[PDB]
Amino acid sequence: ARKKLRLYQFLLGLLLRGDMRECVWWVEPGAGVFQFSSKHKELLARRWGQQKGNRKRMTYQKLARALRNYAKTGEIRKVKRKLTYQFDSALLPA
DNA sequence: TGAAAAGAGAATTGG
DNA sequence: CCAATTCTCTTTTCA
Ligand SMILES: *O[C@H]1C[C@H](n2cnc3c(N)ncnc32)O[C@@H]1CO
Ligand SMILES: *O[C@H]1C[C@H](n2cc(C)c(=O)[nH]c2=O)O[C@@H]1CO
Numbered sequence: 001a002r003k004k005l006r007l008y009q010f011l012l013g014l015l016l017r018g019d020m021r022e023c024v025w026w027v028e029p030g031a032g033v034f035q036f037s038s039k040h041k042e043l044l045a046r047r048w049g050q051q052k053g054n055r056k057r058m059t060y061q062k063l064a065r066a067l068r069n070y071a072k073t074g075e076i077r078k079v080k081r082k083l084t085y086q087f088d089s090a091l092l093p094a
Numbered sequence: 095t096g097a098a099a100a101g102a103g104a105a106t107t108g109g
Numbered sequence: 110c111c112a113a114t115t116c117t118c119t120t121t122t123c124a
Pocket of ligand 1: 095
């Protein structure tokens with residue numbers, strides 16, 4: 001049984017390594033607050049779908065749909081700012 | 095002033 | 110049965 005990345009792991013990994021900075025970036029790195037690019041977010045979503053191996057092309061609408069489910073478990077919450085989210089502090093350094 | 099963004103229930107699916 | 114994936118409909122927001 002193989003393992004596949006979780007959405008919050010994929011996103012957090014992109015931010016820490018500095019990948020796809022034109023697609024997603026930190027807004028407040030100390031607070032774990034990050035924002036997606038209005039025009040270039042579809043590039044990131046489709047990259048998420050290729051790595052997962054999904055049947056359909058991944059879109060930001062479907063990626064955002066998955067992000068909202070994290071509200072039950074607290075990994076990521078939506079911030080009251082356009083395309084902006086916040087990792088829980090348990091997933092961040094000191 | 096419509097695309098964009100936000101939100102959502104629900105059946106589905108790989109593993 | 111987890112962790113999304115996919116599809117659908119709705120409304121507010123914004124550029
Ligand atoms: O066709 C109507 C509505 C449209 N329009 C575009 N952007 C608008 C804003 N910000 N306020 C109001 N109406 C807006 O232009 C026409 C009215 O001038
Ligand atoms: O939660 C139930 C179903 C669940 N389950 C079902 C099936 C068909 C599967 O392949 N994996 C799996 O975890 O297990 C529980 C019953 O043992």
